Write a protein that binds this ligand. Structure first.
Ligand SMILES: [Zn+2]
Lengths: 415, 46
């Protein structure tokens, strides 16, 4: 079990890819300590620890804790996810981009490079937006002494931020080609899980003082494992719809309908989306109307958690459910006479598969919504509190893991 | 709708356990890999 990895890793072909993947995240972690020229990180940290700057939780989570210490990638690979969602809306609505989308190998890599140029530009904006609306905002509230709200800071942050994002986005796409799994995915994943070990450590240091008891903590770690399991149970879970083929070349098979099609993307997506309101509205400190907007979507508070949970549902359902399913399948069965036993070929096959996929996919989504919602409840009754173990914290960690493990075997079959 | 298709293969009945064993390994690995990445940068400060 523990060695089932060992031998399969002791083949240097992959052992090299792990030691690159780990290396790129090492240099990403290295950059996390490269502070932005004019920023008073101690003030930023203080602010984040106060109730006021509580909303910035998720922002600082998906920044990998880079926001907490304005690194060259203050927001991390998150601007790139924002570009990914923008251009994949424009691929649908704008039809000229839909032409380029379906246009084979190089056509799929051009959108990929308009998104790559989408993201890097978006870092410039976000960097400026923060430097302008937030960092030098009040008295230069978060400016080190010597620094001033002038355009010199503005420009010097914009540079630090475009330098940082470009560095990082390049680092990302290496983890895809020369590494394990998917770059971006793994970067996000790294940001969350980094803050895990010290947290786990500090929690048991404070169990001693008498502040926490081992009953509650042992309930929490039990639940994480339980959650980790349930999702593992759900990924494995399938419904097999029997097919059968005519007379040679005539025997039975099954078309598999999963509960959640590799739900890695809709989750990082939903997270990004939820941050859009926070990110725009929160950094205006003095404006009460905006602070309301931001504090609405705060995932810790029930209002935001609900907006978060409805999001994970929708994004999951629409992801899993739309995999160019029913109508082509019903027609493809024509190739060599295929049918679902007992059910008429054609329209009744479509409506059959439609119904099943609909009713199924929905349970897949709902489940993932418990995994989002429950940790908070559980966190609330327990004294333990951190955004890193906040369901969206879990679902991406568990998500990237499976995504990464699944992508090993697909090529490990090939290798 | 809100009707149940409970009769669905769970092709893993208690291979779930080894799935969960894989996930917890993956995370806790990186966890400790990336956890030390902090101290490895601490003794690099001075
Ligand atoms: Zn103010």
């Amino acid at each position: 079990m523990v060695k089932a990895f060992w031998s399969a890793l002791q083949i240097p072909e992959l052992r090299q890819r792990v030691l690159f993947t780990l290396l790129v995240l090492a240099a990403y972690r290295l950059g996390a300590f490269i502070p932005t020229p004019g920023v008073d990180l101690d003030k930023i940290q203080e602010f984040l620890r106060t109730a006021q700057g509580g909303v910035f939780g998720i922002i600082n989570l998906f920044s990998g804790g880079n926001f907490e210490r304005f690194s060259i990638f203050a927001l991390g690979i998150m601007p790139y996810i924002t570009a990914a969602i923008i251009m994949q809306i424009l691929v649908t609505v704008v039809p000229a981009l839909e032409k380029l989308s379906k246009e084979g190998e190089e056509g799929r890599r051009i959108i990929n490079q308009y998104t790559r140029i989408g993201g890097i530009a978006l870092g410039a904006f976000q960097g400026f937006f923060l430097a302008t609306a937030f960092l030098g905002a009040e008295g230069g509230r978060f400016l080190l002494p010597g620094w001033s709200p002038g355009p010199f800071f503005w420009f010097v942050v914009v540079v630090t931020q475009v330098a940082g994002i470009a560095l990082l986005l390049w680092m990302a796409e290496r983890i895809t080609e020369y590494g394990i799994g998917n770059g971006t995915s793994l970067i996000i994943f790294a940001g969350i899980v980094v803050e895990w070990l010290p947290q786990i450590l500090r929690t048991i240091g404070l169990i001693r003082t008498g502040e926490v008891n081992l009953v509650a903590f042992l309930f929490f770690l039990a639940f994480i494992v339980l959650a980790f399991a349930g999702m593992a149970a759900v990924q494995q879970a399938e419904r097999r719809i029997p097919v059968q083929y005519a007379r040679y070349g005539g025997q039975a098979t099954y078309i598999p309908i999963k509960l959640n099609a590799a739900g890695v993307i809709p989750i990082i997506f939903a997270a990004a989306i939820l941050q859009i309101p926070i990110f725009l509205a929160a950094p205006f400190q003095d404006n009460p109307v905006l602070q309301g907007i931001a504090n609405f979507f705060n995932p810790t508070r029930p209002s935001g958690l609900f907006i978060e949970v409805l999001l994970v549902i929708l994004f999951t359902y629409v992801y899993t459910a739309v995999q160019f399913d029913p109508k082509r399948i019903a027609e493809s069965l024509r190739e060599y006479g295929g049918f679902i036993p007992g059910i008429r070929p054609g329209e009744p096959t479509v409506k059959f598969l439609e119904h099943i996929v609909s009713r199924l996919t929905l349970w897949g989504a709902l489940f993932l919504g418990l995994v989002t919602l429950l940790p908070q409840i559980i966190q609330n009754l327990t004294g333990i509190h951190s955004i890193a173990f906040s369901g969206i914290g879990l679902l991406i960690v568990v998500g990237v893991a499976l995504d990464t493990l699944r992508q090993v075997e697909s090529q490990l079959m090939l290798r | 709708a809100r009707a149940e298709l409970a009769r669905v293969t769970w092709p893993t009945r208690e291979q779930v356990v080894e799935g969960t064993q894989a996930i917890l390994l993956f995370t806790l690995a990186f966890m400790v890999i990336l956890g030390l990445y902090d101290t490895v940068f601490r003794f690099l400060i001075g």
